[PDB]
Amino acid sequence: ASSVNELENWSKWMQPIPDSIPLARISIPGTLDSGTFKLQNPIKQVWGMTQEYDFRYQMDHGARIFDIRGRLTDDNTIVLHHGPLYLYVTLHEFINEAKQFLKDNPSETIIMSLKKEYEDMKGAEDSFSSTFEKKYFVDPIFLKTEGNIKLGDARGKIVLLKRYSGSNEPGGYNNFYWPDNETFTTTVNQNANVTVQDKYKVSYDEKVKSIKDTMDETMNNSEDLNHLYINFTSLSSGGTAWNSPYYYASYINPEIANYIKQKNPARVGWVIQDYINEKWSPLLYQEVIRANKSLI
């Protein structure tokens, strides 16, 4: 309704935000490689794994943006993958948890980034894009409206963020440029712009600076509703032992959590991170949600 105490309820933090506001303006916490919580093997975790708890936990902690990577199986089904590794998760598994969360908390909405992570299996009857639309995207939860999506036409639906080419069914965010490992800017739909900082695999120093720099612009340009700001706090960088996404996340998450606190911004943008949990002292996702206080 009209109170900043509705931002402290994670499951329904999107309730008090007016139905007028374009999803881009709102600042939302997200999860990188959302389906890696099932990796329990040691040599698998230090490489793949970027999250520890399931989707529902992720959503109950305030997360609304999910990085979903997939591969086409010969059984004609889309499954979650981290590079070549088969995460023991599937798409239906994700779409079903979303619906569950959205039924219990209809005041919310989840944005689902979908990207082809691995080459299709030979048995594949149809293509990856076509198989997704024909068998999944056709479900009624997926919002089929485009343009600058308002929080009003998104409640209860799933705002798909296409990150795969060859789409044929309208709905959500259209596939835009997006180069490998770096910060960039391009134009999305009719009325929109995107500045994304996906600088994975880079030094810790450079990384932190890139997050702060990117978050610095979103802060100044707080009233440009026509501008998407995706800020990835993830540091993939392999190296195994204490180089893993977990080692890095221990510093970056709290680090950025303070940055947002101290500065007391009016906009922080869509912040995607690794290891959403409650270990980290400051809590990034909570601070990202809180910066939306300016919208009520």
Side-chain angles (χ1 to χ4, degrees):
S2 51
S3 182
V4 294
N5 67 164
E6 336 244 308
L7 283 183
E8 309 302 307
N9 187 331
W10 296 335
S11 323
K12 38 248 289 67
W13 71 261
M14 268 172 172
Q15 192 144 76
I17 315 178
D19 302 42
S20 310
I21 296 114
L23 287 179
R25 168 66 183 84
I26 311 178
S27 296
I28 308 98
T31 56
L32 193 278
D33 260 275
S34 317
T36 60
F37 59 72
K38 286 187 178 178
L39 292 181
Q40 51 199 111
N41 311 252
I43 195 61
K44 274 184 180 178
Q45 302 175 304
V46 297
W47 290 97
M49 195 169 149
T50 65
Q51 302 291 323
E52 16 182 59
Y53 305 104
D54 62 53
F55 294 111
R56 182 45 176 259
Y57 174 103
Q58 301 180 16
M59 294 170 224
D60 275 327
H61 271 45
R64 298 299 176 264
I65 303 162
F66 301 76
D67 182 39
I68 308 301
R69 274 98 115 113
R71 196 218 172 160
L72 239 194
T73 70
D74 54 25
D75 304 302
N76 298 333
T77 49
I78 300 186
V79 291
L80 315 197
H81 256 54
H82 176 92
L85 294 186
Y86 168 67
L87 305 168
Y88 284 57
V89 194
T90 69
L91 231 201
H92 282 124
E93 193 159 325
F94 175 69
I95 298 160
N96 288 324
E97 297 274 284
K99 296 175 176 182
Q100 238 63 93
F101 174 70
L102 298 158
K103 138 72 188 180
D104 292 319
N105 304 290
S107 63
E108 313 300 81
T109 183
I110 90 165
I111 298 81
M112 178 197 95
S113 174
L114 198 242
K115 165 183 162 65
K116 323 127 151 189
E117 182 77 333
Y118 206 62
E119 258 288 66
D120 302 355
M121 293 190 74
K122 310 87 141 183
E125 271 288 301
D126 212 322
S127 64
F128 172 93
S129 332
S130 203
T131 299
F132 165 67
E133 313 202 301
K134 283 161 154 50
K135 301 171 98 294
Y136 301 88
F137 194 52
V138 77
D139 190 298
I141 21 76
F142 289 106
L143 177 66
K144 270 73 173 186
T145 277
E146 299 189 310
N148 198 193
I149 301 122
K150 308 300 172 59
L151 174 64
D153 339 312
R155 286 197 172 97
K157 312 281 267 297
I158 294 191
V159 189
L160 177 272
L161 163 57
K162 317 202 189 88
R163 203 173 154 184
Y164 59 84
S165 59
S167 185
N168 282 316
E169 297 295 331
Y173 297 114
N174 305 180
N175 188 42
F176 52 81
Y177 184 33
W178 204 314
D180 190 73
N181 185 28
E182 67 163 357
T183 71
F184 60 90
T185 308
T186 323
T187 156
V188 220
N189 302 350
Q190 199 205 53
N191 49 284
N193 264 326
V194 222
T195 292
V196 183
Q197 188 266 289
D198 184 35
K199 198 122 62 157
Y200 70 99
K201 178 69 181 172
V202 109
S203 47
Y204 181 86
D205 288 3
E206 184 176 5
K207 187 61 185 181
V208 185
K209 152 268 163 180
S210 291
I211 296 173
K212 310 241 253 176
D213 274 37
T214 305
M215 212 170 288
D216 271 339
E217 184 203 334
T218 105
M219 291 201 249
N220 313 325
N221 190 217
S222 76
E223 295 320 305
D224 188 14
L225 307 155
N226 286 345
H227 205 323
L228 236 313
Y229 281 102
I230 308 170
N231 210 297
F232 286 96
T233 87
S234 321
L235 243 181
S236 79
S237 189
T240 314
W242 295 157
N243 237 301
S244 45
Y246 190 69
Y247 176 61
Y248 286 137
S250 300
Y251 301 110
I252 298 184
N253 296 334
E255 176 71 277
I256 308 301
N258 279 283
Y259 196 51
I260 305 165
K261 184 195 284 179
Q262 293 293 97
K263 295 292 182 69
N264 181 355
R267 165 112 98 138
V268 161
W270 300 3
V271 181
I272 287 67
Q273 75 196 83
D274 291 5
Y275 296 93
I276 194 162
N277 62 34
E278 285 157 310
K279 306 168 180 286
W280 311 152
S281 8
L283 293 191
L284 224 191
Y285 52 93
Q286 184 176 224
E287 302 309 328
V288 179
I289 293 170
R290 282 178 172 157
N292 272 293
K293 89 181 86 63
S294 49
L295 285 177
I296 354 174

